[PDB]
Amino acid sequence: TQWDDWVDKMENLNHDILTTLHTARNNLEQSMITFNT
Amino acid sequence: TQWDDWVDKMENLNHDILTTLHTARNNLEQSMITFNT
Amino acid sequence: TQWDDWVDKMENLNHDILTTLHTARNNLEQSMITFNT
């Protein structure tokens, strides 16, 4: 159904955003540490 | 109707975000290219 | 009720985002002013 496909898309996006925020923060932490070398 | 106005607002925001992301990415690409000059 | 708790969470997040955007913009303005010293 159209509703089930929306649900499946929503779940996949939840996961991608989690990974994306984790990567953003990890890159931010790296730049700060490097800058404070 | 109130519902129609929400719909119209939503559509206009869809467009503004599209333009805004395109501008953000274009500015990012410019800074990288300049930095790698 | 579960619905009332969602509503209360939504309101608190509205407030946190407002403060967060204000802080982001204030930090951006500071960095520009400092850079243009």
Add this chain to the structure above:
Amino acid sequence: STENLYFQSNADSVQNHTFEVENNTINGLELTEEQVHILYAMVLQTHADVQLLKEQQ
């Protein structure tokens, strides 16, 4: 001082486009937040309609 002047110009350009990326991104966040406010309104209104329907049953 051409070389140095040019590369200082590039450094300034990189900094300024960074300010612009940040401004664009904050504005983008602000726009998504506005859409979220609208969705929230639509959702609350639909809930009220549904509640009435449940009573009317």
Add this chain to the structure above:
Amino acid sequence: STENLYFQSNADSVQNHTFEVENNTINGLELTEEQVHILYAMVLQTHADVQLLKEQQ
């Protein structure tokens, strides 16, 4: 070394406020995502209510 020390201080200040803008923006994204999770929950719950209503018809 006053001049140089001052301008190095400014450069560090610009860098650090940039880190802060980035931190604020990532946090803002994280907050909008939390609102999206709530909206999603509200929407799913309303859909379930609507489905029952359609059956009850």
Add this chain to the structure above:
Amino acid sequence: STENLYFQSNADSVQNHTFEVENNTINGLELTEEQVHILYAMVLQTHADVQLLKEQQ
């Protein structure tokens, strides 16, 4: 030139991770926007279902 070369390497590294943070954040915004499009679709569909129910009453 070891010291200077190292610290220039660090400066480049900071700049590049900044580009990466910006890229990650723009991508994150783009993802939340996609979720917002889905929520909007779900909300519109539920509204249509509710409207039919109101007529059927």
